[PDB]
Design a binder for these strands. Structure first.
Ligand code: MG
Ligand code: MG
Ligand code: MG
Ligand code: MG
Ligand code: MG
Ligand code: MG
Ligand code: MG
Ligand code: MG
Ligand code: MG
Ligand code: MG
Ligand code: MG
Ligand code: MG
Ligand code: MG
Ligand code: MG
Ligand code: MG
Ligand code: MG
Ligand code: ZN
Lengths: 53, 216, 120, 114, 122
RNA sequence: UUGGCACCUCGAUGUCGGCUCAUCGCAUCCUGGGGCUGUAGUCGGUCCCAAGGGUUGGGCUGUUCGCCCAUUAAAGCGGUACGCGAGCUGGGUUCAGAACGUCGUGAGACAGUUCGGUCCCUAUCCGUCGUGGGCGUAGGAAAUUUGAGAGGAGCUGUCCUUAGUACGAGAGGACCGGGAUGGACAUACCUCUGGUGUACCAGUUGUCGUGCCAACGGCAUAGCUGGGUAGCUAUGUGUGGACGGGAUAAGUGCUGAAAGCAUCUAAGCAUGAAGCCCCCCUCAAGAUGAGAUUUCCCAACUUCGGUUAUAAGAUCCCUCAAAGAUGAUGAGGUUAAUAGGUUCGAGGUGGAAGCAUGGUGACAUGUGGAGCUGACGAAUACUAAUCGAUCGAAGACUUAAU
């Protein structure tokens, strides 16, 4: 099976409405103040849950 | 006509008065309370709303459905009850025989009562036509390239379309199912359990609704 | 239990390797799913070590790998000996929970959630 | 255990007058035939080839050779239909399920006694 | 569980030794028969001199099955073999003797003469 | 149907039969309701209403047909590109090989036969089956709901009794009514019977290892073999099509004139089908006509139109399963039993290792229902669900009544 008609610019962009990524789930590291992934070690300072890793 | 809510515990068996083996489902139906009374005057129809299985009290930073939120806590407190996990209406009962805040004990039913039991059937996820709709396979040999496919979906130019209701792969189970004319084998008031003859829909821990059988 | 994208024999082999490496090094970097599986394996091994009897040593031998650990004092001991010596002694008074997992974030090559699993 | 509620509600179904026995033991099972209004005891004697399940659900199976034809009877261990069970002989076997006897006849099928 | 093409031993002295099932009686689309059910069958093997001959199309009642039967009390009975008895229109056996044990369900089927002739009824 | 015509398609509209999946008509095969009968009864014949449901396995043949075997209440007739090959097959048939009969001088040929002979395609659109997000539904929310509409279901045997009665010389043998129990189908479910059960237990071969013994590991389909938990399951276990109401069809009538009689019909009034509308089951307010009930939140600042972060609430992220392709759903996130671990069990396996004893030994016995044990039950914060962040109201106008 093959496309019977080409896809308009309009139809293509409608289809891509939901094709996107989200901002990561991130919060400020309470130790060093730099952003980190929630529930992950902070890579800037190596800290997690008030302790060094 | 009577009604109660319980959780499906699991199946077992009991020996009857003649030694016949009776398969049973154990339903734990503790902590049923009449939360609201609906009437033709206020609501347009008669029914009792029953709440089942106390959940925990409201707390500030609640993160799960274990803790009642403020709307639910107010609703239950109006009945003077603790907030409840499951809330369902029974239209088949006589509203005048119940008071808001009243307990509905398993003793409302008696052994021999014929009942209808309603639950949500077990989910099966995405399933094909053979399993979901019970269709026949194609040949497994003799050169076949048709084993579990759903088969023809229409005819030809007439009608150049697939009719609504065509049976196709999709999500299976997880549907409301009523089993009619089961029987109350036993009522154990100490344990707050009803032994129902036979099997009922849903996984273990699933919510089940027991009503007096509509057909009589 | 997870399958970890491997056949039964390959999965068993990988879990023995991971558990032995964790016993040896006391903390390893690996993927999240692998760590969540090996925590159970390792803690069952710790339980055997704490039991300490000969039957338990042989049951542990079924799982551990044959690896030599060179101690600071130029002395050597097997992973099994380390398990039934210092690790078991360490966790005598602890009832379960001999491992912890610390999520690190996706790695570059395939986006796998890198984690650290360590003893204690 | 099994679920506490299941055990609690089925506890009174359990019988306490049954002798201990194992697969490979030869049993005489006295069974109440309640045909019509007359009741009589028919004895089924044979080797226990199977015991399975738990609580009120537990069952056992006994095998006999009748007129040259093998016959297997499976009972709920706690059925009131059984008047009593007698352990006629203790067998020496090496596994829980003696399905291999189904394929054996005569001296080949004999169970050593303990 | 007896179906078309199932072969069965004949548990009698009618002359038929082995039958092949042609039909399970008792409704359209009925797939399987068990103890106490009647089948149409053909005699594939026969004893020289018997009343029933090879190639006869006859009716038989199933008296033993490997599948067995379940009883209202939750007990079961199963046999090592599938066996049937050739019958007349009045449910009486074509032969005069029955061999091997038979299930008690035949009584509820009203095959009283077969039950009486059986050496054992279980 | 056999044809006639040659109007679409020869820069391709795949052709018989079968398989899978159906769907529609009714000129009805069964079942339901009726009139007539050369209808005694049991059976039938013929015609009318009726499309709700149902309407079988095999032998032969490529076959469709058809004959046959055995059933069944019945084994309906037709349309849908003689429904369905981007769903399957490819036996027939119209490519290349070969052969027979036959025709032909021959090359070759034959709606004659025979053996053999490549069935491609990752679905863009509509359509269909599932599953999410947006906005709307004049504040923001949590639950519970009405049911406009829509979908599902809808079949039938046999036996007992009435009653060996009515009817009939006899043979035979009922209606109506009351019970029991099946076939097929549908649906839920795993207590039972069984299947599977690749991180459960055990036996065992070959070979390579862990130095050796003993004990174990790797590989040989999970090496093979005997069992087997949960889950998933049918052939297993429960349940359903019950009882009814309203209006009708063919019919059957009452009263009744037109037409002093007659007349079911014109007015009027009854009765009458498995069919129609309900009763039963499921979905359902995007029902933009966006419905209803209960409960929750409710202030400051304003260029005074309005705004604001916050409230109730919900999420991100995280631990998960009864849920699941992913979203979604549901159980939980320390004021915590959500999972892992740990402890105790269930079920499974069936007698661990070590040691002792008896044997020359293979082995046997005891210690000891031992040891082990994924998913199932209970308990326990030991580990991980940290610290955090985001979103989310202030309620338009008109009129009437108050
Ligand atoms: Mg098929
Ligand atoms: Mg294939
Ligand atoms: Mg292997
Ligand atoms: Mg073209
Ligand atoms: Mg008609
Ligand atoms: Mg043949
Ligand atoms: Mg066609
Ligand atoms: Mg096509
Ligand atoms: Mg061909
Ligand atoms: Mg040629
Ligand atoms: Mg010539
Ligand atoms: Mg099961
Ligand atoms: Mg089970
Ligand atoms: Mg090697
Ligand atoms: Mg050795
Ligand atoms: Mg090799
Ligand atoms: Zn930091």
């Amino acid at each position: 099976a093959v496309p019977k008609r080409r896809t308009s610019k309009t139809r293509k962009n409608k289809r891509r409405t939901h094709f996107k990524i989200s901002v990561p789930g991130m919060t400020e590291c309470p130790n060093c103040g730099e952003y980190k992934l929630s529930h992950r070690v902070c890579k800037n300072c190596g800290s997690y849950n008030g302790e060094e890793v | 006509t009577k009604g109660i809510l319980g959780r499906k515990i699991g199946m077992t068996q009991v020996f009857g008065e003649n030694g016949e083996l009776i398969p049973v489902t154990v339903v734990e139906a503790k902590e049923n309370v009449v939360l609201q009374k609906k009437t033709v005057e206020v609501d347009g129809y008669n029914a009792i709303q029953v709440g089942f299985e106390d959940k925990k009290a409201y707390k500030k930073d609640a993160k799960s459905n274990k803790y009642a939120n403020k709307p639910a806590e107010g609703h239950a407190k109006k009945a003077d009850a603790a907030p409840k996990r499951f809330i369902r209406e029974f239209r088949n009962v006589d509203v005048d025989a119940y008071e808001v805040g009243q307990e509905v004990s398993v003793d409302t039913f008696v052994a021999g009562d014929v009942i209808d039991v309603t639950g949500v059937s077990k989910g099966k996820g995405f399933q094909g036509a053979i399993k979901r709709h019970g269709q026949s396979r194609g040949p497994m040999s003799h050169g076949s390239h048709f084993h579990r496919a759903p088969g023809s979906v229409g005819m030809a130019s007439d009608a150049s379309r697939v009719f609504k209701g065509q049976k196709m792969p999709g999500r299976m189970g997880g549907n409301t199912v009523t089993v009619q004319n089961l029987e109350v084998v036993q009522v154990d008031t100490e344990n707050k359990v009803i032994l129902v003859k036979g099997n009922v829909p849903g996984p273990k821990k699933g919510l089940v609704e027991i009503r007096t059988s509509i057909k009589k | 239990y997870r399958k970890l994208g491997r056949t039964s024999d390959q999965r068993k082999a990988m879990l023995r390797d991971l558990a032995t490496s964790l016993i040896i090094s006391e903390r390893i970097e690996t993927t999240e799913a692998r760590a969540k599986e090996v925590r159970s394996v390792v803690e069952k091994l710790i339980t055997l070590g704490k039991k300490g009897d000969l039957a338990s040593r042989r049951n542990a031998a079924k799982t551990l790998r044959n690896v030599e650990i060179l101690n600071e004092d130029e002395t050597t001991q097997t992973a099994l000996q380390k398990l039934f010596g210092e690790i078991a002694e360490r966790y005598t008074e602890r009832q379960g929970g001999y491992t912890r997992i610390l999520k690190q974030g996706p790695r570059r090559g395939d986006g796998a959630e890198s984690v650290i699993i360590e003893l204690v | 255990t099994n679920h506490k509620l299941i055990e609690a509600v089925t506890k009174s179904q359990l019988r306490t007058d049954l002798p201990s026995f194992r697969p490979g033991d030869t049993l005489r099972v006295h069974v109440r035939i309640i045909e019509g209004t007359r009741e009589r005891i028919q004895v089924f004697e044979g080797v226990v080839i199977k015991r399975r399940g738990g609580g009120v659900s537990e069952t056992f199976t006994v095998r006999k050779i009748s007129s040259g034809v093998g016959v297997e009877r499976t009972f709920p261990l706690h059925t009131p239909k059984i008047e009593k069970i007698e352990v006629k002989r203790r067998g020496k076997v090496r596994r829980a399920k003696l399905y291999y006897l189904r394929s054996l006849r005569g001296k080949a099928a004999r169970i050593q006694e303990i | 569980m007896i179906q078309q093409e199932t072969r069965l031993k004949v548990a009698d002295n009618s002359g038929a030794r082995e039958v092949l099932t042609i039909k399970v009686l008792g409704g359209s689309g009925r797939k399987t028969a068990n103890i106490g059910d009647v089948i149409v069958c053909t005699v594939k093997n026969a004893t020289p001199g018997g009343v029933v001959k090879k190639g006869d199309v006859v009716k038989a009642v199933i008296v033993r099955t490997k599948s067995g039967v379940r009883r209202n009390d939750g007990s079961y009975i199963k046999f090592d073999e599938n066996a049937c008895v050739i019958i007349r229109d009045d449910k009486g056996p074509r032969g005069t003797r029955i061999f091997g044990p038979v299930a008690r369900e035949l009584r509820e089927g009203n095959f009283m003469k077969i039950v009486s002739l059986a050496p054992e009824v279980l």
